[model samples]
Target: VLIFHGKPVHGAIFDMDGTMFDTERLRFQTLQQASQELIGQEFSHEYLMQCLGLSATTAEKLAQRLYGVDVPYKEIRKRADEMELEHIRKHGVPIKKGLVQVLERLRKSGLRMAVATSSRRAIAEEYLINANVYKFFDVITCGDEVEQGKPHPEIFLKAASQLHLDANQCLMFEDSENGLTSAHTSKGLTILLKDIKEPNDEMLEKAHFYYDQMYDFLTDLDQFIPVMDMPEMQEPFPQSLNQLTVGIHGFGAIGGGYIAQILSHWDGYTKPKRIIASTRNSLFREAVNAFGTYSIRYGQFSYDERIENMSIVDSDNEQQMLEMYTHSSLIALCLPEQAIESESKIIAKGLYARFNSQLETCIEPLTFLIILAKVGAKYLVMKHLKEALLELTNDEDVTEHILKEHYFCDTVVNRMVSKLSNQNLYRQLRIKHNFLEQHLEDVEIEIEDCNKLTPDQLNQASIYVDNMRRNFQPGHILQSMDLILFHSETDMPIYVEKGSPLLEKLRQVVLVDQITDIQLIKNRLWNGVHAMLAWYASLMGYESIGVAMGDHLVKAFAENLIAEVKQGLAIVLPNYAKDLDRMSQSFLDSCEYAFKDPCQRVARDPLRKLNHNERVMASIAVNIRHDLPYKNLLKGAALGYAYAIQFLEIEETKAVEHLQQQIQNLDLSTAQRRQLEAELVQLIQYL
Candidate 1:
């Protein structure tokens, strides 16, 4: 056994068609069999060899060249196809002599082997499988999988990629001018297995190694695929490391809430291999210690009978947290929405540096998980991961292929615990579980089963997914999950009454700006509607927004407003309108739920062009313009905007001064600001 870095190299990629598998002779025999029946004479082997790698259509053209364009190439093709399959079925493929020994030696060396061929799957399966060699390969990629065929380097390129081995690292065995050409084009180590009568300069220059016959291959197989020179792979994560490892970069409401909840149900929760407490301040870590592990029991079921919660046993430094991540696959990061960028860089640098340092020793694929309060949180994690990954691999061109290799998921976290608040939170927990810890006043359950962290648990425990970006459809993944594990008391009532599809549909369409506004509107309409109505009823208290909605009806105003948004969208900003509708739908029924969550957030910086905002406001204005008798949307918009402006209370002079500075700094012409001022005046009519 040969060893490089004291590890065996157990990988072998073989070639078919000519070198070790002699199917070419069978093909030519079939062609001759057809030619003889048509012309009543045996076809020469040299004539049939002319059409070897060419397709039927191209071969037909070649035949036409020999016999004139009018010659019925179709008739020749039909006849040639008749006996090929039958002949192969009757007489099994004659193996290249000594192939079995060479293959056996490679296999004995413990190499992971595959067959890389340009032949279609049907041909490979029929010839390889029927020959009883199908199970010998780990992967078999065909020509059709890639855009370019042989000579374009795509087929061999794909083969090397699938093997997770670099092109230079892989040796492709080939025989034939075309096959050798393609192999060389792909930057692979080329071994010419078949002998050449005339050694052309190009052929000699291209070939890395060559052998005259199968016996030569068998005699020195180790030289072709050296088993001893392979590098050592890293040790895999220990299955014994069941202890938990938590990486918290931000300690806001969500982060604090996560700590408190973990502390409350410290025992019931999955015991991580290690625990890491991180935050901007030492105070948050101190708070986590004070509550201890038992404090996590805030909203757990049957809390009275559950064991005392234990706080994290240790607080690791940044280096320790990163190092633990290298050995611990169950990595979780908790950072808020606003701090996604900051959190992402830290996690990316920490993980990538560690991963890069220890990659050679790893046995299995690694999973990196980001935890946040809502669904959209993953977008930030991915954003930062993408940035750091780019920085790491900046030397390489075309980053999409590299970026796609790592898994980035927008996951849903369903732990019910909320942040520390002195007021009646214990009483609130008492109202539900009645076993609230008297010492902790800050914690409240985010939702039921919140401590279970079903999302993060399943996400971590799940196998490293392959090509999830393209494979996972938004509606499909969300529809498959059980909501009971994620929702709160408020969420439960609405979910049961309206059912999941409506919410799922709504979730499918939600937009970013709508998270606090429209998504909250749904929750307000569903959960807080009655309370809002009661409060409204108590105050001057219209019964609800619906009641106040129609109090001031203006048909002309609504009709015009609706037209404005639609027209502005269709005329000024078509793409924004399309995205807006998509965003709106994702939140409601379309892709609504996919939009609102901060973690798995969609990109919108490009969408922030002048046309986009204008179209949205114009769309709202058009809704106001709509004279539709059924819904008075603009009046509600006016009311909402009025309240919003009052709540925000911007200083108009300062706002204009800020705009003036921006305008002056921009390369805009002076005439642009006059048009803007006019548009602003027209837009303010709605408010």
Candidate 2:
């Protein structure tokens, strides 16, 4: 039996001439002799090769077309068959090596076997019997019975049908190109072992498994029959942390959503033992502690899943935080950008606790996961953590190398996640989770679930929600999940830094040769345009991104900005230039489709957003370097400026004048500076 991910192959199918027996070359020898006897000269070996997977009747008809109208293909084939039989009888079957062991093992493994051969029934019978593997196959479908023969899949289909199984449930073995094409079209897993014909590049891709010989495949089947989806792994991970304990610092959206999702959805051998999560906020800590289990909802699928075996700790609890940090197999810093400095100190002291010998455990190396919500997030986290470490332990010595051994893995997550906290959204969540049933705003609530959170508690939750970016019932993690950031046409490719073998075991986590491009691409293309659209949407009085995108004025503006950004991207990211539009459009569609994401929510902190290296200004800077058409970008920035002034209530300031001042201050060639400022003024008025 063969396994695909964990899907099993219950039946085995083999082609007789070349796959099961080493008879292809022998058949070629007799064919040459037969052609010589009739025509006084041997036919081309290529002509004999083409007849490999065809029935006697089909080969006869084909020979007539290719050889000549007068060619006696039947007389040639009959004489060859007789000659082959005589030689085989004299020398015994030239069976492929390791055939008996494979047959015996597969038979013992309880796989139903079949011979889907292009040879006639008598020839197949005689060949298998001579090889002494005839009893191994429960059924045989010969080419003579099928009108179309090998490349048509008719023989394999009939063979599988006789065995009472689907063709795809079988492992197909073939040597000839025509047989392989048939096997491939049958949708079964095919292994090609070259015999007479050396496979071409097309055949290389067509085969699911390729080997030089049958014995090469023997080792693959040794332990392949075992159930792959079994709970435990054969080998130990992390050497000592036999059971995976995922520790997350912050149980908010990302901390709960992607952190738990990645950890719990461990592929292959790794299975999580427990998740030790910590929150800096006491409110988040206490609230999660009350439930112990967190629920996460996939807005993409509109499904909710709850995570188990989790315990929340307050970061203020020094001993517990250190314990969680010290014992974690994998640690995720799903914290907000502002908490980098403070949390660094908190984690630094935890490492201090690790070195201080409070742990009677070995200082096993571990990996840290920091998502790209903020650029250079892992760098900043490490800087503060190390800075605090240097200050705490007195001069970056002895423990410096110890801390250096631990790695902060840089990874990017385009997966959007939000914490639960809205009123109507909360009500809808309760209804979806079956906590209550209602249509009108009477708000019927459950006893233990609803009453546990008092109106004072509820209002606290609401304010906290307003503070949050969104609710989640997972198969529930925190409270209820609102919106999650998902990768659009933009690749959600998980780019990981090199040197970490621990993460390499994880599926979908790609280890790049250099972790340089994706972060810049992810941020500039998505984040810059995302902020640009949000400001324009909010200024237009559209409550949510979905509402804003419905207006073509807002949609066209966002698309044009994306178009302009790609011009600069062509220079900066030449290789990825072709993909920018696709990625941008994916994000654009996402805004309108899932979650009625608030425009004001994204448009908040406009002053910080318009900073020199931030989203809006950064996009402008990239285009200005090449003097590309940045009119759409300037329009977005102009709209962003007016929106910010209006939202911040800056006492009726002129946005165009302020923007004009911005362009003049920009470091550029003397000529374009005035041209840029003039264009900025003109575009701002057009807005």
Candidate 3:
């Protein structure tokens, strides 16, 4: 799904007159006009407030009680309805400001929308149809649809039923105290959007949430929490034994750069005896092996934390992979998305070894700690592992039985862990920071591609390269490396299942019952915006994100782009509202996140970033779907498309055409696609 609700809500129920349209204010005006002409006086504000949430039949009875039966109430009321209809026909439906925006966003977010109002079917249909918003709702439940009207929960309940949701699983927006009390009594989430009648004490108390106007509720609408995605505790495993070793498989940025450093330096928790990190990078393995210690740096200058008790294992070497799998008490399987299949084979073999060990010796039954740090990937790894197990022995019973024993302790991951690519930015950063050299036992130097070093630094680099050659053969290092600059932001807790056995063992860990909302929010807000920044920065000829942020134009662009992305993110994953502002700010502000963020480092795999539901395109897509402002974001995306064109070495002259071709395949309406192309081309010159 593109978006999630804040509290497992599948539908939203809108109140007709004041909440959805400005008809209530018109009703009040017309009511006063008719009353003045007929009774020689207008209705009081207090009398109008009393009639707000009532149907025509109920409100007419109210007039009789207040103004006396001889006051010609029926003629005045008839004239009032006539005046309201005539004004609507002449001036069109006055749909509330922010009403269409919220409905559009909710519709795009996969919410089933409905309208439950005290207005009759004729008036309800006329107003909604005239406003061109009749198409937005999946169901329309008006006063005539229910036996009991406002102040009774029947209309709201009927509306929820038509949408196939319980009242509690929908949002009921009301503008009157009666509507609020009814929605609240129905057990639905109630929001009070003010109209002519200022909210009274009862309304203030009954309203689950409040907004002075429909537009004011838009922010709240964006931060819906999909409680459906909340993680609960999983099946438990037996306790762990002491003198423990934590095996880190797929030790790239998340695995090696963040997870490994976290495990090594943490003191308050039960520390692991050894942190064995496995990766395909021969450079990282050789360098750490040569130095006996590796340092992780941050832009804060003081936090060059050392991984003291660590060992490196090549992911390709089956012998090493098997040994770590069999011996270690806990395994952290952290591979990139594409590497799951190849790596799961090794994991399968390791599991088979343990399964065979069940027959051979008295081994401690491994309290298999699972840690796959990607959204919707743990099951793919399991599928591959199961397939591999099936290929080996062709025994389904044994595979399922054995797999069930190993706890699938998945984690929801976040944070910006920057990496090194085939570029000179990081190579320049290494020498400038006076980094890597301090870890030299015999050899210590980051692989360089740029001629940034002065006479003294290059002389030191020459000595370092000399040491590197002694330990390896020709072409031992190159511009491309799987190196990660450990940002201070990566130190946050990795959310795991609530009742996992590792909860006590793994420090800096939190518990959640589900992770869909968490993963969804992080993907769009953090990963999405970071890629846009990198893409825009690179196009502007800046080497690093920090350098790009230094420019006023670039920083201003980032501010606007982030603003657009933030609202879109909230629209899709609304429950993340509390942390999104803080998280997004930290990502931009260099003081909060001192990563020395590189351009091409994050801009790696530019094509994937342009994918339909990926970071950049989807960020823009949500804004487009909701008719929200995204011009700044469109420019950023245009720059990204240009960056991808350059990366793939596509001819620069046909860059806009290539961007058009790419955008054409996205899951958007044809008209939306046209709008995207038109706006994108206007910004294409910036590239």
Per-residue alpha-carbon lDDT of candidate 3 for residues 610-673, written as tens digits (9 for 90 to 100): 6667677777778878878978777767777688776657565666655676677677898888
For model 3, what is the alpha-carbon lDDT of residue 124?
81
The per-residue C-alpha lDDT of model 1 at residue 437 equals 38
Would you list the rank order by TM-score, best first? 2, 3, 1
Q: Report model 2's TM-score to 2 decimal places.
A: 0.52
Which one wins on TM-score?
2
The TM-score that candidate 3 achieves is: 0.47
Residues 1-687, candidate 2: write the lDDT tens digits.
456436687889898878878777887888889988997778788877777656778877777787788897778878987988898987888877556656765676788999998778887898888766788899989988998986898888888888898988888899988889999998888999988767889999999989888866864664464322312211222111124466888777667766665566443333465788876656445545555555666555555556666788877788888887677757888778888888888777766766665542325667777764766777788778877887777766845764687777887666565565545444644554453223222321222357567877887776765444223212232344322222121123356776655575455465666666767777677777887888887777877787777788887887787788777877888877655765766676677653446777777776566665566666787788887777777777777777766777653355555555555556677886677666655555554
Candidate 3 segments whose C-alpha is farther than 4 A from its true place: 1-242, 250-253, 264-269, 279-295, 308-320, 336-341, 358-376, 409-412, 415-491, 497-499, 504-507, 589-601, 604-608, 624-628, 644-678, 685-687
lDDT: worst 10-residue window of model 1? 487-496
RMSD to true structure for each model, in Å = 24.5, 22.7, 30.4
TM-score for each predicted model, relative to the true structure: 0.31, 0.52, 0.47
Alpha-carbon deviation at 44 in model 2, angstroms: 81
